[PDB]
Write a protein that binds this ligand. Structure first.
Ligand SMILES: O=C(C[C@H]1CC[C@@H](O)[C@@H]2[C@H](O)[C@H](O)CN12)c1ccccc1
Ligand SMILES: *[C@@H]1O[C@H](CO)[C@@H](O)[C@H](O)[C@H]1NC(C)=O
Ligand SMILES: [Zn+2]
Length: 1016
């Protein structure tokens, strides 16, 4: 049935980790093709019965924000490009054009008059204008979560289906900075047949070109059978621009970019300009151009050649359309009429190219190699590895993951009902999806845009968060109020969201205090939501105006609680120390919430005049020389003081953690009898080179290994409670916190790099684990890939994206660090893990951004740290390119990315309140998630439709007996099901009509989509 993703090592022609081990990566001058060799071809290869078919594919790369905002580019460039494409393609039936970015296209189309909409639909229907990929954006592939890659793909393609009646099956990704196999994974499950990529390491292009392995069937690293494979074309040269797309010699190709003759303010840096094609020069010009084409064709296996013709924001001016088209038409007429060339050249689209390639394949002309692996870390030249953008602008990288979750929760909570149009649910959800989708752009989440553009993305995301909050709180009010009492005002805030980790303590004072008092309000209802499809317990905290608060469930059962102070860290500009101050009027109450699968649970907080029976109070110990008093108002336990010292803590039956006198972890002891395993946190700094190339938003070019941050004698705060304990320390640039709740600790870093120019702050873990040169990092939150540190490459080449987690292991022990935000990281020595926190860079790094990164702001990074024994786990063999999490590590990752949501009832009394929603929802096996639940129809549809994306991960078997869980059938989650269909992941095509209206669960590492239809 299901493929075994652990025990069967796939047999592929190219496995990227193996290729990396063998490659020497020498950076030699290849001649005119600087990173290749002088290509030779046999002129007799092509003849009358075997011609070279050349497709020249006009394109225009349009960034949804980079050096200008989305709206600035739309007004100055993109609207003109699309208007002139419409005119020119209409008037010139053989001209072609491809378009990728649907965020821009949708904007443009909705502003067109009906006559022009109709003209536009006609040039799409007739194949002159072709959509490629059809996502909202062309996303980053390093930092993006797979859930958001799917979200933006779906946003663009849903628009295209509705308005253009087309769904692209070929993908075009010419600009992301390195490439991930998560893309073919999602695309192949969304109807695609082909994809194109460009930015891969120059040494990889050379190696694959030598073997004609630039076109390959790209399968997942664990896929033994090959069912995931997607045909992939990798472009061979340094850029997608015209000089690097006609052939190997850019001095020649630049002469065929007819926008470079002077009047457009462009020129050829190789110092030979284009010349207008005429009858007196066409034979000579054609002989140069065809020679470049035949050289490029040597790198590929069929007689069908792809020649992109475009660059950034091209095809704007009418005069530009004319100059490119007329000159190429003259070349085509000459070349195609001169038999000695044995070439047929024409304008074409991307799909036309791929169709012709597969026709050649089926005619027996070519067989294609199989490939697995990824294409990180990219370098475009010399030692310029693009690992900096794995960290750049980390505040917005963290915001991405918060908004990811809020979009999921808003779509899920509101999916349970149909809503009247006056509720503006669909409106707010569309806004949220579109702003999050926009940020997936390869200058958004990457942190590679100008400062004012970053500000625009942030503002858009804030509006999206507010939209999600509105939808979430309206939904909770409807789900938990007696139906005959429910009386909604769709503009009113029935609940406010309380989020403890965004923007976070020390970043924004954004959270509301629950204000209780005998003379104002005795009690307050709070509600937790659990988006995951299994019962979940999690500690939750709220701010309250008294320490004398107790918690009950709605059946009035007492719930054990802990009260702790509200501590804020202050950079004291008088004493020159970083130290905590406690509130004397706000307090934190903490208790364990238990919430049904995809459900809600209500609790009540009640004030009393004295310490409640079921509430305890944490102790607090401030470790520093030269302490001063720390009053805490009504808080019943006095703060204690001491000189810095080592300390040890244990919460519940969980691990015992030991800390240095500097407040940093030194060891973890898993159980009572077990060893104190050395696990040391350390903060270090990288700098920038004083000669040669400088680090910037894209490039990490360190001036050697990192140097320790000088810590001085930092102030350490120890809070010890029955439910939660923590150690926090004010270090230079980081308030570092280790929080213990009875399992793997949570780490929070409040990172403020301040004015430290040309500094990158790294957090490192040092252990004994005999990992050697092996470590594992994830791709897009979807899969873990084996990495091998290569000392033959520079330090920055050994940095990889850490979009959600990383681990090291030996035969016996594993250490996994899970993240709540994408950051860059590595293992630079056996037993180590490290992850960059922020970077502040004064210089531009010559990739067009035209600024350094000097707009840092405080960010709260979150993590879980899981030390485990793995000697009993069934792991892949030494040759398998994947790794897999344990149950504990996977749940830890879910605790960061999809925590419980917390709602505080706004008014004094909630009439008709109910205690729970979803108690009857199936509690699915732990490896299964309902990644997306989305109602697909508005309230006017007679047949309601609800879409589900189901993802099953793969967890290691380590000898923990499986407990019976319930089968999850998403098609019966809503009543009155009339049909259940398996669909593509975008919901746009029905693939299977399902027997008995039952949606089967999916196999390990598989993702499926289902749509249920309800007659209601
Ligand atoms: O590669 C680029 C720019 C590429 C890659 C980085 C990315 O931020 C930008 C924008 O997305 C543009 O689309 C071009 N991209 C470059 C190279 C040399 C000089 C100037 C620019
Ligand atoms: C859209 O797609 C196909 C081919 O263009 C056509 O048969 C159909 O009539 C068009 N319109 C629809 C499905 O509304
Ligand atoms: Zn770009």
């Amino acid at each position: 049935q299901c493929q075994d993703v652990v025990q069967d090592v796939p047999n592929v022609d190219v496995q990227m980790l193996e290729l990396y081990d063998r490659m020497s990566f020498k950076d030699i001058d290849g001649g005119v093709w600087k990173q290749g060799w002088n290509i030779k071809y046999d002129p007799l290869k092509y003849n009358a019965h075997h011609k070279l078919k050349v497709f020249v594919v006009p394109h225009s790369h349009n960034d949804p924000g980079w050096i200008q905002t989305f709206e600035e580019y739309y007004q100055h460039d993109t609207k003109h490009i699309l208007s002139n494409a419409l005119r020119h393609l209409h008037d010139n039936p053989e001209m072609k054009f491809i378009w990728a970015e649907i965020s821009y296209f949708a904007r443009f189309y909705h502003d067109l008059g009906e006559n022009k909409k109709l003209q536009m639909k006609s040039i799409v229907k007739n194949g002159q204008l072709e959509f490629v990929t059809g996502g909202w954006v062309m996303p980053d592939e390093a930092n993006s979560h797979w859930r958001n890659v799917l979200l933006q793909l779906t946003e663009g393609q849903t628009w295209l289906k509705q308005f253009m009646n087309v769904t692209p099956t070929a993908s075009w990704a010419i600009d992301p900075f390195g490439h991930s196999p998560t893309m073919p994974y999602i695309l192949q499950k969304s109807g695609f047949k082909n994809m194109l990529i460009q930015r891969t390491h120059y040494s990889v292009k050379k190696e694959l070109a030598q073997q004609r392995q630039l076109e390959f069937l790209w399968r997942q690293i664990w896929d033994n059978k090959g069912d995931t494979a997607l045909f992939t074309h990798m472009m061979p040269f340094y850029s997608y621009d015209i000089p690097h797309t006609c052939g190997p010699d850019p001095k020649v190709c630049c002469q065929f970019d007819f926008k470079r003759m002077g009047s457009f303010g462009l020129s050829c840096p190789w110092k030979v300009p284009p010349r207008t094609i005429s009858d007196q020069n066409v034979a000579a010009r054609s002989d140069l151009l065809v020679d470049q084409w035949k050289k490029k064709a040597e790198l590929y296996r069929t007689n069908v050649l792809l020649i992109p013709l475009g660059d950034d924001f091209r095809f704007k001016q009418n005069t530009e359309w004319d100059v490119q088209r007329v000159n190429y038409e003259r070349l085509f007429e000459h070349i195609n009429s001169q038999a000695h060339f044995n070439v047929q050249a024409q304008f074409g689209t991307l799909q036309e190219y791929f169709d012709a390639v597969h026709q050649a394949e089926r005619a027996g002309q070519a067989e294609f190699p199989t490939l697995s692996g990824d294409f990180f870390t990219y370098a475009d030249r010399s030692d310029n590895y693009w690992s900096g953008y794995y960290t750049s602008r980390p505040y917005h990288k963290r915001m991405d993951r918060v908004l990811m979750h809020y979009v999921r929760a808003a779509e899920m909570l509101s999916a349970w009902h149909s809503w009247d149009g006056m509720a503006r649910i669909e409106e707010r959800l569309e806004q949220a999806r579109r702003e999050l989708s926009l940020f997936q752009h390869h200058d958004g989440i990457t942190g590679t845009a100008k400062t004012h553009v970053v500000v625009d993305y942030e503002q858009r995301m804030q509006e999206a968060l507010k939209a999600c909050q509105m939808v979430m709180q309206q939904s909770v009010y409807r789900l938990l109020t007696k139906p005959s009492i429910y009386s909604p005002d769709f503009s009113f805030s029935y609940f406010t969201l309380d989020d403890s980790r965004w923007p976070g303590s020390g970043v924004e004072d954004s959270r509301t205090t629950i204000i209780l008092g005998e003379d104002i309000l005795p009690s307050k209802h709070v509600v937790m939501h659990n988006t995951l499809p299994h019962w979940r317990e999690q500690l939750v905290d709220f701010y309250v105006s008294s320490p004398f608060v107790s918690v009950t469930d709605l059946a009035n059962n007492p719930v054990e609680a802990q009260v702790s102070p509200v501590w804020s860290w202050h950079h004291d500009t008088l004493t020159k120390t970083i130290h905590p101050q406690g509130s004397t009027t706000k307090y934190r109450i903490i208790f364990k919430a238990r919430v049904p699968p995809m459900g809600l649970a209500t609790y009540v907080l009640t004030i009393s005049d004295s310490k409640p029976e079921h509430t305890s109070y944490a102790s607090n110990l401030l470790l520093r020389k030269n302490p001063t008093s720390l009053p805490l108002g009504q808080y019943p336990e006095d703060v204690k003081f001491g000189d810095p010292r080592e300390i040890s803590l244990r919460v519940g039956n969980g691990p015992t953690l030991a800390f240095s006198e500097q407040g940093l972890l030194k060891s973890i002891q898993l159980t009572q009898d077990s060893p104190h395993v050395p696990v040391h946190f350390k903060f270090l700094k990288y700098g920038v080179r004083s000669h040669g190339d400088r680090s910037g938003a894209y490039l990490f070019l360190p001036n050697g290994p990192a140097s320790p941050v000088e810590l001085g004698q930092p102030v350490v705060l120890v809070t010890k409670g029955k439910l939660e304990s923590s150690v926090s320390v004010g270090l230079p640039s980081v308030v570092h916190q280790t929080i213990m709740r009875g399992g793997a600790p949570e780490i929070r870093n409040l990172v403020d790099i301040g004015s430290l120019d040309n500094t990158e702050i790294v957090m490192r873990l040092e252990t004994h684990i005999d990992s050697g040169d092996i470590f594992y990092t994830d791709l897009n939150g979807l899969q873990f890939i084996k990495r091998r540190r290569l000392d033959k490459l520079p330090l920055q080449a050994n940095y990889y994206p850490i979009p959600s987690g990383m681990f090291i292991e030996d035969a016996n022990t594993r250490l996994t660090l899970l993240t709540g935000q994408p950051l860059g990281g590595s293992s630079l020595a056996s037993g180590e893990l490290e992850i960059m926190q922020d970077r502040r860079l004064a210089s531009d790094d010559e990739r067009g951004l035209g600024q350094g990164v000097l707009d840092n702001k405080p960010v709260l990074h979150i993590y879980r740290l899981v030390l485990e024994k793995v000697n009993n786990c069934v792991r892949p063999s030494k040759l398998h390119p994947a790794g897999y999490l344990t149950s504990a590590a996977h749940k830890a990752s879910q605790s960061l990315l999809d925590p419980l949501d917390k709602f505080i009832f706004a008014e004094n009394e909630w009439i008709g309140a109910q205690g729970q929603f979803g108690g009857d929802h199936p509690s699915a096996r732990e490896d299964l998630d309902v990644s997306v639940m989305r109602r697909l129809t508005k309230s006017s549809a007679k047949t309601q439709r609800v879409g589900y994306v189901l993802h099953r991960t793969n967890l290691m078997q380590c000898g923990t007996p499986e407990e019976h869980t319930q089968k999850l059938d998403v098609c019966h989650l809503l009543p009155n099901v009339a049909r259940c269909e398996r669909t593509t992941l975008t919901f746009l095509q029905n693939l299977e009509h399902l027997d008995g209206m039952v949606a089967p669960e999916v196999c390990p590492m598989e993702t499926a989509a289902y749509v249920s239809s309800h007659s209601s």
